[PDB]
Amino acid sequence: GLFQVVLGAAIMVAAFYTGGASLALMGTMSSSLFMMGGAMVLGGVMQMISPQPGGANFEVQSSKNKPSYAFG
Amino acid sequence: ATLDTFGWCTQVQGGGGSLTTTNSDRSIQFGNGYMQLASSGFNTTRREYSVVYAGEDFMAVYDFCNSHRIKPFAWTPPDGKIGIWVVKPNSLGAKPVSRDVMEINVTFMEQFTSME
Amino acid sequence: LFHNCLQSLYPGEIITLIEVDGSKFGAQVYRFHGENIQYTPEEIMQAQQTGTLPPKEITFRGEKYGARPFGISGISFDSSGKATKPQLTVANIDSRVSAMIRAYNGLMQAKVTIWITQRELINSDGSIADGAYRKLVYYIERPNYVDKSVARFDLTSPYDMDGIMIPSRLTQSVCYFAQRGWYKTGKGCGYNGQNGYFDKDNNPVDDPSLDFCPGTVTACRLRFGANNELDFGGCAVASLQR
Amino acid sequence: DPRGISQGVEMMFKKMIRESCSQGGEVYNYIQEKTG
Amino acid sequence: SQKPHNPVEMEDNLISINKIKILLAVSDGEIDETFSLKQLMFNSVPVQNEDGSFNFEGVKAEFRPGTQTQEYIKGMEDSSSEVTVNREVTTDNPYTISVTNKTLSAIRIKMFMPRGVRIESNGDKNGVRVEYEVQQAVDGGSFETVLTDVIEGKTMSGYDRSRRVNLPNFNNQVIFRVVRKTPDSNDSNVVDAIQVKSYAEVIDAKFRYPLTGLLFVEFDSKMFPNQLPTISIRKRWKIVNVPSNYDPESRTYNGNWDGTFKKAWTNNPAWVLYDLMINQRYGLDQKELGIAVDKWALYEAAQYCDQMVPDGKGGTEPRYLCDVIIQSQTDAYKVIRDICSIFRGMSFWNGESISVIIDRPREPAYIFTNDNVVNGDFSYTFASEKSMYTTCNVMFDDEQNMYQQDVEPVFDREATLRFGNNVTSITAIGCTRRSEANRRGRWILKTNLRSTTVNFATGLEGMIPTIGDVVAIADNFWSSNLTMNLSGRLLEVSGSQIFLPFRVDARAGDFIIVNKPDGKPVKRTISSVSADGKTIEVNIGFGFPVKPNTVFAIDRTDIALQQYVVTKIDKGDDDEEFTYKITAVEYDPNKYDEIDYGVNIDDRPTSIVEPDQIPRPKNVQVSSESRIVQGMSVETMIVSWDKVPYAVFYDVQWRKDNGNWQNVPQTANKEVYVEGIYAGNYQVRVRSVAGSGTTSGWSNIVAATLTGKQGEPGRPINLTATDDVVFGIRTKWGFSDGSGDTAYTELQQSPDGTVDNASLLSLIPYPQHEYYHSPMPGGNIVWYRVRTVDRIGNVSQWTDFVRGMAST
Ligand code: SF4
């Protein structure tokens, strides 16, 4: 059938289609939304295939050898 | 505070003049057919009316209706209980019957307190 | 077999069954079913003349199943690591489920299996081979909802690693052995009665019923003898002097 | 109409994030426990 | 190991002084006044240990309580000085101090030694010890001896020493006197003169720091060659608003608490919670608004907080005490909830109550039945499986390790038989005793197991009950199928009042329960039921009238009411308004008794470490030894001491008599041998050192004299030979015997008649000579000879016998 789309809000509109076809839209929406960029160091599919919480970690050996963000 | 009682008489035709009642009661059902009845305020019945008029001086009545939906007035349609009435928003329409007269439909609500 | 039936355009009726295991605590195993059972007019006339009405039971694999309505929520197998809890719904009319929950502390640690097969694949005596099946297993965690009508349960899997910190051999001063693997077992407890028995206040008793000695080094000093070897797990001086 | 529903949903979520990041919410308690 | 140091307080030699000043800030507000040296600590080591002795010797300090009308600390003397000049005498007591300026704070006196020496007949040089004092006067006083200073040593270029004196509060003027407390010398060769050449006086600093507690510590710089020690105190703290009929020390309750407040010290968290919620400087009403707090609930909390309950090793003790110190900024909600967690009492409301309710064995207050909720329906929900624990870990601030954290777990055996291991971790917020940590752990362990929440919604009845009121539930659903719960009735007091329920038979039980408009529900024994019509007659007597269509409930021994605790009440709008959502949790009437009797802890055992006072050497002896080389004599100096435990490496230091200490290099032999020490007087003292570096105190001065060559007796010279065969000369031979290689010379005496009264000295020959010829004789004249030996150290020898001579 004809598909007249609404530009303002597509997320809620897409679910209202009965069409015996909302399942594909739901699956695609979830899969695509999981990969959206944010503020995390590690990327996309590297998390979805086999997760690995990534981040540089340094042990502390002395208080006078740990720098900072230029306070003093 | 010069109030103006509604004029131009009244008539009943085409489902005009039927009253309407509005209440302000809240009730809760307990169980086993037990209910608790309560009312917030003073339990006043805001009566509503619908009026249809057709006559030669339709323009003056239309002017009155358009200019008196902000300030109230008095009008005693069925029984003589004087009331403080005000026209509802966007509830005024006109229908044509002849080149000289028109048909006008208006709805009235009863206001209490304020009176101005 | 069942794969071939599923791989066709017109499969037949499909059945789903649930059972709950509680024999670990001493709880009977329950079994439920639905699907509605039709009644023949001859049975109706027999019930009319004799004035009785027997409830309908149903015979699948093993022993028969009861007649209770139910429902199952979303089931997913995600490799992203997120753990999802499906929901159970069980109809409750005779309050038997509520009494079970009251008496048996909510039957939390229970084992549930879900069986899905096809009706005509089952022979007339309810015996089918292991060449084709569909088995799902979960564990109950909480009786989420209890009312006069519907009782609802949540399920998880051993993949839910909430809590469960890995290194737990903390340097304590109170008998880490007598927390997980308790007294009189050969793991860490070598105490074999020896010098009698003692109670919560380390009082000397003689019956084999009231026995309890938690943590304190004095307890064992007493159970094991003054100068004899000790099986205490943990150090007496937990931390150095400041 | 889906447009009004979407607008209400986004406004409600915007209020929810502030009511949860404030004193009492799950994120506040989690941060207090973790960072300390 | 422990930090090194060395106590140095016995300043008497030529040595300068260097001091360090540290001023510390103490908790805001008023504090107790008990500042004794037994409560001041260096590196978690007390300064003065009861009677004992001084661990860190020579420490000056003064303290303030922290009120508005304090007086400034006389430390941190700065802002230059004035300094006058004069040098008279310190023998016949001259010199005075006539300060008048009231702004003056302290006075510095500098004393001068021009020359200090002493000689003997032998020419050896020693030192001189002299004593002074400094005395105040005050208006009409006894001059109040203050400062005592000792000076010794051997000097040839001068010695300076400046001391510090602090003025007392006065009205008109203050007089200081300088006195000498030793006999004055004479024209004999003993040099001792005292000169004072300073009037260094100055203000110090007028910074009294109002409203804050202070602490001023002074010590020397030589004592610490490494990182300075952390300073701490052990004493009471902030004065709290205590109720009137309350003695904090004895924990009494006179009765009839009337609201009047007093100021004292307490450890009850009930009263140091109210202090935080009301203070305007650093509390909760910061925006100058008087907030309302329920005093009666806090009084009941205080009464419950001091119940006597034993645990551990007997010895009943109060069940909740809190003494904490705050040093970092945290959110107010966190601090308030951490303090409230000691009670585990609820807190709620915003405007008119601000209240706290402790978990007590409370009584029911309101009845709810199937006819007092919406859609006659109750919902049941429970807790997640991960919330049921078996062990909890509790942090600490331990008393016997002196506020170092520790761990004490809490575990219940019964819960471990069904679930497994579920572990938590809760940081204690000030429990200084192990038993209360165990009680706190068992609190959560017991409450988490029992949680059967039941919720429902009601009508206008929600305005009556508040949070914390235990309510009773008579639900038909959970109570099998029998009901005995309606809202009928038809009479007030009439006596069994017919009590016809419009439906439902109901049956015979113990009591029927009614809801009074204001008071607690009243139960009366349902005897003489007479259920002939199955719905007639219940009770015996009743008080006050009862409205029709009122609620009731019936209970039995087999089936009874269920008690719950209300925690949350909610309200609706525009369709619900008069409804009130309510939730509740299962009530427990016996968990406190199980809590109060389920803890067992022995103690913290002692450990093996270095002691704070390393013992001094016990006894010391000084001897010598001798050897003969190159004609002269060589001595030795011998010292010894007992091997004292906890001591590796010793130290030896000695002078002549009084001049200047010199250090013998560090030795571990426990004995010291030094050769070639010249004759004179000597003294020796020996310290002790440990592996860490902490040196002990000084020993007892032991003095010895080295006369020479072990003492030893001389040996007489043998075989004096007199001959009678030499013409015109008389001669004599001899033999200096063994060990005579130190002979300075021989002594030759010649008598004429063998009488010792007629023996006179004749000559004195050199050591490398034994024979002597004396030519001026007459013929046949008889003479006699006597010969002895004198040594280099002028040690004589016993005379020999008299031999005869006969000239030719
Ligand atoms: S001291 Fe020994 S016997 Fe006692 S609990 Fe510990 S391991 Fe077991």
Phi and psi (nearest 5°) for E285?
Answer: -100, 40
Architecture of the domain made up of E80-205: Sandwich (2.60)
The span from the CA of E611 to the CA of E608, in Å, is 9
The H-or-E segment that residue E217 falls in is strand E212-220
Number of inter-chain CB pairs under 8 A, B vs E: 32
Handedness of CA E645, E646, E649, E654 (dihedral sign): negative
Burial E409-432 (b: 16+ CB within 10 A, else e): bbbbeebbeebeebbbeeebbbbb
Minimal-distance CA residue of chain D relative to A9: D3
Query: Best of E380, E387, E389, E481 to disrupt the C interface by mutation (most C CBs within 10 Å)?
Result: E380
- Judging contacts by C-beta atoms under 8 Å, the chain E residues touching residue B36 are 459-460
Query: Does one domain contain both C220 and C133?
Result: no
A51 contact residues in C (CB cutoff 8 A): 80-81
Q: Any idea what DSSP says for residue E646?
A: S
State the closest ligand 1 atom to the C-alpha of C191, by its place in the atom list counted from 1.
3
Considering only the beta carbons, identify the residue of E371, E377, E459 that sits closest to B28: E459
Q: Tell whether C109 and C132 lie within a shared domain.
A: yes
User: How far apart are the C-alpha atoms of C58 and C66, rounded to whole Å?
Assistant: 7
Q: Is residue A17 part of a domain?
A: yes
Question: Smallest Cα–Cα separation from E484: which of E499, E465, E496?
Answer: E499
Nearest-Cα distance to chain D for A13, in Å, is 6
Structure tokens at E208: 């009294």
CA distance linking residue B76 with residue B88, whole number of Å: 17
Query: Of C187, C191, C198, C218, which is best to mutate to test ligand 1, by the most ligand atoms within 8 angstroms of its C-beta?
Result: C191
Query: Is E706 in a helix, a strand, or coil?
Result: strand
Give the other-Cβ count within 10 Å of E499's Cβ: 21
Q: How far is CA E516 from CA B30, E367, E550, E551, E778, in A?
A: 20, 10, 10, 10, 158
Spatial distance between the Cα atoms of E651 and E655, rounded to a whole number of angstroms: 14
Judge whether E366 and E427 are in contact, CB under 8 Å: no
Taking CA atoms, C137 is separated from B95, C86, C97, C134, E345, in Å, by 72, 11, 21, 10, 42
CA–CA dist E453, E451 (Å, integer): 6
Residues C69 and C185 grouped into a single domain: no
Q: Report strand pairing: E470-473 vs E366-368.
A: parallel
E625 near E635, Cβ under 8 Å? Answer: yes
Q: How far apart are CA E11 and CA E150, in angstroms?
A: 8
Q: What is the largest CA-CA distance in chain C?
A: 93
- Using left for φ > 0, alpha for ψ between -120 and 50, and beta otherwise, residue E580 falls in beta
> Ligand 1 pocket, C136 CB below 6 A?
no
Tokens found for residue E407: 């761990």
**Calculated CA dihedral for residues E707, E708, E713, E717, nearest 10 degrees:** -130
Cβ distance E572 to E582 under 8 Å?
no
Separation CA B39–CA B44 (nearest Å) = 10
Assess whether the C-beta atom of C220 lies below 6 angstroms from ligand 1.
Answer: yes
| Chain A residue with minimum CA distance to D5 | A12
The overall longest dimension of chain E from CA atoms, in Å, is: 178
| Domains in chain C, number | 2
Paired sense of beta strands E117-119 and E195-196, if any = unpaired
User: Residue A10 domain-assigned?
Assistant: yes
- Examine the domain organization and report whether C146 and C233 are in the same domain: no
Candidates C56, C110, C66, C112; CA nearest to C91 is: C66
- Is residue C61 a part of any domain in this protein? yes
Chain A residue closest to C80 (CA)?
Answer: A48
**Considering only CB atoms, which chain A residues are within 8 Å of D13?**
none
Judged by DSSP in three states, E92 sits in: coil
Looking at ligand 1, which residue's alpha carbon is closest to its atom 2? Answer: C232
Alpha helix positions (H), chain C: 2-6, 41-50, 96-103, 177-180, 217-223
- Among E388, E390, E402, E382, which residue's Cα sits nearest to residue E441? E390
Asked if residue C65 belongs to a domain, the reply is yes
Compute φ and ψ for E379, nearest 5 degrees.
Answer: -105, 145
Touch test E–C: 3 Cβ pairs or more under 8 Å:
yes
| 3-state SS class at E340 | helix
- Residue numbers in A near D6 (CB within 8 A): 8-9, 11-12
C220 CA distance to ligand 1 centroid (A)? 6
Q: Are E219 and E19 in contact (CB under 8 A)?
A: yes
Query: Which of C223, C229, C235 gets mutated to test ligand 1 (max ligand atoms within 8 A of its CB)?
Result: C223
Determine the topology of domain E620-706 in CATH: Immunoglobulin-like (2.60.40)
Contact E244, E215 (CB under 8 A): no
Q: Is C234 in the pocket of ligand 1 (CB under 6 A)?
A: no
Rounded to whole angstroms, how far apart are CA atoms E225 and E651? Answer: 17
**On the CB side of E24, how many CA atoms lie within 13 Å of its CA?**
15
CB-ligand 1 contact for C188 (6 Å cutoff): yes
Q: Where do the domains of chain B lie?
A: 25-110
Q: Could you tell me if residue A19 is inside a domain?
A: yes
Sort out which chain B residues have CB atoms less than 8 A from E373's CB and list them.
30-31
Domain match, C48 and C117 both? yes
For residue E750, report the phi and psi dihedrals to the nearest 5 degrees. -130, 100
H-helix or E-strand spanning residue D5: helix D2-21
The count of other CB atoms within 10 Å of the CB of residue A16 is 10
Query: In this structure, are residues E395 and E407 in contact, taking their beta carbons and an 8 Å threshold?
Result: yes
Please state, in angstroms and rounded to a whole number, the distance separating the CA atoms of residues E215 and E619: 41
**How many Cβ atoms from other residues are within 10 Å of residue E199's Cβ?**
17
The upper half-sphere exposure of residue B73, i.e. CA atoms within 13 Å in the direction of its Cβ, equals 16
Kindly tell me the sign of the dihedral angle through the C-alpha atoms of C46, C50, C55, C59: negative
C177 lines ligand 1 (CB under 6 A): yes
Same domain, C10 and C51: yes
| CA of C114 vs chain E CAs: smallest distance (Å) | 22
The answer to whether D and C touch (≥3 CB pairs < 8 Å) is no
Q: Are E117 and E157 in contact (CB under 8 A)?
A: no
DSSP E strands, C50-174: 70-72, 87-91, 111-118, 135-146, 150-156
Range of the structural domain that residue C191 is part of: 168-242
Q: Is E371 on the interface with B (CB under 8 A)?
A: yes
Q: Cβ contact (<8 Å) for C172 and E407?
A: yes
Verify that C73 and C131 share a domain, yes or no: yes
Q: Is residue C127 part of a domain?
A: yes
Residue with tokens 């080591």: E45
Q: How far is A3 from chain C (nearest CA, A)?
A: 29
Residue-wise DSSP of E549-607: S--EEEE-SSS--EEEEEEEEEE--SSSTT-EEEEEEE--SSHHHHHHT----------
Q: CA B1, B2, B3: angle at the middle one, nearest 5?
A: 105
D8: distance to nearest CA of chain A, Å?
Answer: 12
Chains C and A touching, counted as 3 or more CB pairs less than 8 Å apart: yes
Chain E interface, best mutation among C100, C109, C159, C173, by max E CB count within 10 A: C173
| Residues C61, C174 within the same domain | no
Instruction: Give dist(CA E604, CA E586) in Å, integer.
Output: 39
Q: Does A46 touch chain C (CB under 8 A)?
A: no
Which atom from ligand 1 is nearest to the alpha carbon of C230? Answer: 2
User: Does C208 reach chain E within 8 Å, measured CB to CB?
Assistant: no
Instruction: Note the maximum CA span of chain A.
Output: 70
Angle at alpha carbon of residue C49, lines to C43 and C50, rounded to 5°: 85
CB C121 within 8 A of CB C5: yes
C161 occurs within a structural domain: no
Closest CA to E448 of E566, E600, E588: E588
Q: Output the CA torsion E605→E609→E610→E613 (10° steps).
A: -10
Q: How many CB pairs under 8 A join C and E?
A: 105
Q: What angle do CA E575, E579, E581 make, to 5 degrees?
A: 115
Class of domain E718-804: mainly beta
Within 8 A of E384 by CB-CB distance, chain C residues are 141-142
Domain hosting A18: range is: 1-33
Contact yes or no for E407 and C217 at CB 8 A: no
The closest alpha carbon to E323, from E230, E439, E234, E442, belongs to: E234
Ligand 1 close to Cβ of residue C232 (< 6 A): yes
In this structure, the strands spanning E231-233 and E40-42 are antiparallel
Are the Cβ atoms of B34 and E487 closer than 8 angstroms?
Answer: yes
User: Does B contact D via 3+ CB–CB distances below 8 Å?
Assistant: no
The Cβ of residue E134 has, within 10 Å, a number of other Cβ atoms equal to 19
Written as six digits, the tokens of E728 are 């015109």
